[PDB]
Design a protein around this ligand. Structure first.
Ligand SMILES: Cc1cc2nc3c(=O)[nH]c(=O)nc-3n(C[C@H](O)[C@H](O)[C@H](O)COP(=O)(O)OP(=O)(O)OC[C@H]3O[C@@H](n4cnc5c(N)ncnc54)[C@H](O)[C@@H]3O)c2cc1C
Ligand SMILES: Cc1cc2nc3c(=O)[nH]c(=O)nc-3n(C[C@H](O)[C@H](O)[C@H](O)COP(=O)(O)OP(=O)(O)OC[C@H]3O[C@@H](n4cnc5c(N)ncnc54)[C@H](O)[C@@H]3O)c2cc1C
Lengths: 649, 649
């Protein structure tokens, strides 16, 4: 009963697309099991303002990500590098996966991030068509309400970019080699050409723009809707309430509220998978040809290990009765970003400061994401690729936001009350984040929301009684995240001083200065950078360098004092992935090593995170997997003018 | 059963002509379905005074347009721009469509209105013969009883026209470029040549005349009859009570009281249409070659959308099970006019004021339509075509009427009791009205009288915290209808002062002044126009200009105070159309885009409303469609001396 040539686990960001383009482009019987259910008529999801809690009950006013009925609750172990706290990250449960609860921003990643870090047969020129297909299928829209702050910021970054171009340094964070001598920045003219950060040819690596492309749409009424995988690939036009396909998709048979705990094996090939229905009773599903797993970043290692594939020593220590294959790499090598935050306050006359921040309110067409640029490398960064003098990378993503987005305790401590209406927010984050972790299960019975999740982000360095030059490379490798965070702070400071001069030039007689990071510290950091140079981070370890000069010890105190911001004055970005990268757990065909008929086709099978937000990465993976499993480039050849018909239901 | 090569939906203003000239000029079997029935022996329709209710029952004294047994009841949504009211507009149901309940006035439109706004292959030189055919087939007659007021008005407009000609301004509302230096105004001589506003060569764009051409006739008895499509194209000479043609029209088979809710399709071509008879039971009609739809302005979008052609997202939201084609333009871009009204009272001796308004009573040969001119553009109008310095357009239509035609509440508030016999009426209306709307269905089951009809006419402008010169074009575009209404008021004021001086010159020692619009406001508006000039409308938004001078704030108060007249002191003219303009829903052959064998040939398929009343536009469309569907210019070549024989039965 309930057989299937291809069995798909989870209707995540790639599961829905895989099921759709697999049922349509073939004639086999396909069955999909998803833990969540459709939310097509849920006002909290469809309305973009539901992210801010416009439909919450009065006595249960919690966020959608913190609701265990919408997402997995992945509580993590205490963090040695984050002052011994236990933050909780979530994965959206339901059709579309984590695209039901995100902030609806799309980035493609770039050209170099796929050209260098990815293995052969996987570069940008092979996934360009899949990326374009995904983007046109989503069909995003830019921001509609334009503000005066954005033009001033654009001209400021333009001035900084032209100064850096005239400088002659090898690489900086406003240098786009593929463009040329002309700075890669948008124009402040009201009739400027809208510059895109997702160009089809990948010519824009680091560049300043005016807006991103939200995953929203405007309806005939005037209401805005949320566009994501669920309402783009698996609407009512294809699957009914009985979970059956119609038309040429009749081979698909999707089952909702179905979580699968284990894949049954015959020793080296899969024969069936079992799930538990809403009755609380178990069920059996028989697999014919292959098994597809789309369980997301944090939870494909668990389903792989619990099913019998993984480190046999630790699995035996846990108590796994049935063992299949032994790799010491299952679940290791996952990556995630981190977003330090800064707050800038404007001082002046009330009218001028009220007019300066015009057109900033949270709107469904932007969700507060005005955005500035995807910045690159710092001039003082020690940890840079060897071939940096040949290509330009992506390291930072500068985005502007209204209000003061900071944890409440830090808001009270710093005094930045949201009642103040003369301040805004800009965020610089790291997309090539260094620190790494691991996931291990604790019980081989059922997939639980809390496995052993060790993630230490900003660790320190303990000097030893060894020669300094012998140990310095180790310290440089270890202290990368703090270096990146402080370089981001310096970049924000340069952008801010350019903002001040440009705003004074543009007729607004106001001044913008940093207040949140205790500007004394930031100004001292800038002075120390200028007076020291490439060896600025040597004083991160005070007793190792042993300068013992008042300037040197004061800089050591400043560096130790400023390390608290990157650790506590931010919130962790939920872009985890790449826990089963190609070569570690799967080959270049996304098939498991040593196994015969199991395939994994989500973000968990990514070699390295992209140079941007990873919405399109998962779907793209699925798209590629569609033609890898079918055997012909059916999906990649389809013309650009073919999008699934969007049904609101 | 009941097959047909050509199936015609509705015997509207164009349906009857289409059926007649299609059955006569071909040999195919034609079947016509109409929701109404013949009213050839109904005294309310035939008698022109039936419009004023001369045959109403004592306990059901309602107008013919407000009777749901004669017309559709198109109640509209609340109007933000009209103080939140819900006026109801109607479409005449029966043979001839809305020509059974209209006021029987014919205008051709002009030369420029077809030369500029219409696409290629559709200009005036291509539809001149169709227009002449329609006019000679109707064979209208002018007014018979001439009054003294008309000559005085004609000489007043002549004086104003010669002054404007001597002025040298680029364009005004008594400047006809095609005529020359001599003013385009009729002569006050008793033996003057009757000037026509429907000249075959289209040389009269803006010109003053003495009367229009009513759609009436005088019978041998002396009784007057109503001439319209029903008694001009589908009399007893062609179709009997069994709905069968006779003679060379025997291929036609018309069915009355037949409303069609949906056109059945085979995927891209129509195969049949279904209707419901007077028994209340359904029926099936099979289509052979093409389907013709003539359902009128408000109701062709509904029949198009409900049949499966239109915006698939909104149709799916409604619940349309069968879907055909997807356009975001079905039902959008419709136009209608609006007629502001003014009342003038004469003060003097009772004998002189009784003699001044001689020959004004409502007569079937004029129906109170003495009329003055089709006026043009104002000198202070900001919204004018770029090429206005090359051609002359039509914007206003000045017509005189007896009594006080104004809603009863406003009559009581202003005190203009109809018991007063020293006042008359003149109407200036906009034929190029700016505000636009949309129609959307709410149930995909049956054509209902009340779909979602959003029509906001006179909207306001809300200033923002932005530079004034940056936003001024937006305000100018938005505030067009109020500008046009106040310019019409100023035109009426100039005509009125010329009337006063000319009447004082012509031996009548009386004075004519405006009373209804609270003449203080009109005189202040004239003074403000004179003292300000082209930037008179800048004070429509008081805080944006920020003059804050007693004259300026007083003018702002006057402009805000005078905006109530155009909103409430009038009634909406029922000349809606152009909801499926060429290029939006149909091509230049009036055929639906993407469909194979469906054609629409009524006013709904008009690119832009004409520069006049749209009686002849629909029929003309049909005429053109006759030779488009047959393939040869059969109808357009027929000599001028061929009219269908008029049977009273
Ligand atoms: C607050 C927030 C904001 C974000 N903003 C952005 C943004 O602006 N841009 C961006 O690119 N990304 C953003 N993200 C991240 C983005 O939502 C996802 O990280 C991205 O879609 C990649 O993850 P995924 O969809 O592959 O994982 P998912 O597909 O979401 O992984 C979980 C899925 O697997 C299924 N599943 C898992 N285990 C099982 C099981 N045992 N049985 C059955 N089904 C199972 C679940 O039902 C669910 O469908 C944001 C995330 C959060 C939390
Ligand atoms: C009070 C009043 C005064 C007017 N005065 C003038 C004037 O002086 N001059 C002027 O030019 N115009 C005037 N008009 C407008 C004029 O009557 C029409 O607007 C003009 O004929 C253009 O509309 P139409 O005939 O194409 O629409 P119509 O043909 O009248 O549209 C409705 C027709 O379609 C048919 N129909 C619709 N839906 C269906 C269906 N589902 N099944 C079957 N049949 C269907 C109806 O039976 C009817 O025959 C006036 C209108 C009104 C209300």
């Amino acid at each position: 009963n309930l057989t299937g040539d291809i069995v798909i686990i989870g209707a995540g960001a790639a599961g829905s697309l895989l099921a759709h383009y697999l049922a349509r482009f073939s004639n086999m019987k396909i069955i999909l099991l998803e833990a969540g259910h459709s939310h097509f008529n849920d006002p909290v999801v469809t309305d973009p303002m539901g992210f801010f809690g416009k439909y919450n009950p009065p006595n249960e006013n919690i966020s959608m990500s913190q609701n265990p009925s919408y997402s997995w609750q992945g509580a993590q172990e205490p963090n040695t590098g984050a002052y011994g706290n236990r933050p909780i990250i979530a994965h959206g449960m339901g059709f579309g996966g984590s695209t039901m609860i995100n902030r609806l921003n799309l980035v493609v990643g770039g050209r170099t991030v796929f050209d260098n870090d990815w293995p052969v047969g996987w570069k940008y020129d092979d996934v360009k068509n899949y990326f374009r297909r995904v983007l046109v299928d989503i069909n995003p829209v830019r921001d509609n309400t334009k503000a005066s702050i954005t033009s001033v910021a654009l001209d400021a970054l333009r001035i900084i970019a032209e100064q850096q171009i005239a400088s002659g340094e090898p690489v900086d964070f406003l240098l786009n080699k593929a463009t040329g001598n002309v700075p890669n920045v948008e124009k402040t003219t009201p009739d400027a050409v809208p510059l895109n950060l997702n160009d089809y040819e990948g010519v824009n690596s680091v560049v300043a723009f005016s807006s991103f492309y939200m995953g929203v749409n405007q309806l005939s009424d005037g209401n805005y809707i949320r566009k994501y995988a669920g309402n783009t690939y698996l609407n009512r036009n294809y699957v009914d309430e009985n979970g059956r396909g119609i038309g040429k998709f009749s081979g698909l048979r999707v089952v909702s509220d179905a979580v699968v705990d284990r894949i049954i094996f015959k020793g080296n090939r899969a024969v069936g998978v079992n799930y538990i229905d809403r009755e609380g009773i178990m069920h059996y599903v028989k697999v014919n040809k292959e098994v597809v797993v789309t369980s997301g970043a944090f939870y494909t290692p668990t389903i792989l290990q619990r099913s019998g594939i993984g480190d046999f020593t630790y699995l035996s220590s846990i108590g796994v009765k049935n063992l299949v294959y032994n790799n010491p790499l299952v679940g290791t090598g996952l990556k995630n970003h981190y977003s330090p935050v800064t707050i800038t306050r404007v001082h002046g006359e009330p009218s001028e400061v009220s007019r300066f921040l015009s057109n900033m309110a949270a709107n469904p067409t932007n969700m507060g994401f005005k955005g500035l640029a995807e910045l690159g490398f710092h001039r003082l960064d020690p940890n840079k690729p060897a071939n940096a003098n040949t290509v330009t990378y992506r390291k930072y993503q500068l985005m502007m936001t209204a209000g003061v987005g900071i944890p409440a305790e830090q808001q009270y401590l710093s005094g930045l009350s949201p009642s103040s209406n003369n301040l805004f927010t800009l965020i610089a984050d790291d997309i090539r984040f260094a620190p790494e972790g691991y996931i291990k299960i604790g019980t081989p019975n059922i997939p639980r929301d809390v496995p052993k999740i060790f993630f230490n982000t900003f660790v320190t360095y303990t000097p030893t009684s060894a020669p300094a030059d012998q140990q310095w490379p180790i310290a440089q490798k270890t202290l990368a995240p703090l270096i990146s965070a402080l370089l981001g702070y310096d970049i924000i400071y340069q952008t801010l001083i350019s903002m001040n001069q440009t705003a004074r030039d543009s007729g607004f007689q106001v001044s913008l200065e940093m207040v949140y990071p205790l500007n004394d510290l930031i100004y001292k950091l800038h002075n120390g950078l200028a007076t020291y140079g490439a060896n600025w981070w040597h004083y991160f370890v005070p007793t190792l360098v042993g300068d013992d000069t008042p300037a040197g010890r004061e800089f050591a105190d400043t560096l130790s004092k400023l390390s608290y911001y990157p650790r506590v004055g931010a919130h962790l970005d939920s872009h985890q992935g790449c826990s089963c990268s190609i070569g570690r757990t799967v080959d270049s065909n996304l098939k498991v090593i040593g196994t015969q008929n199991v395939r994994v086709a989500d973000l968990s099978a990514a070699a390295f995170p992209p140079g941007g937000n990873t919405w399109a990465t998962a779907s793209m993976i699925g798209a590629r997997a569609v033609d890898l499993i079918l055997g012909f480039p059916y999906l990649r050849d389809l013309p650009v003018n073919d999008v699934p018909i969007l049904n609101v239901n």
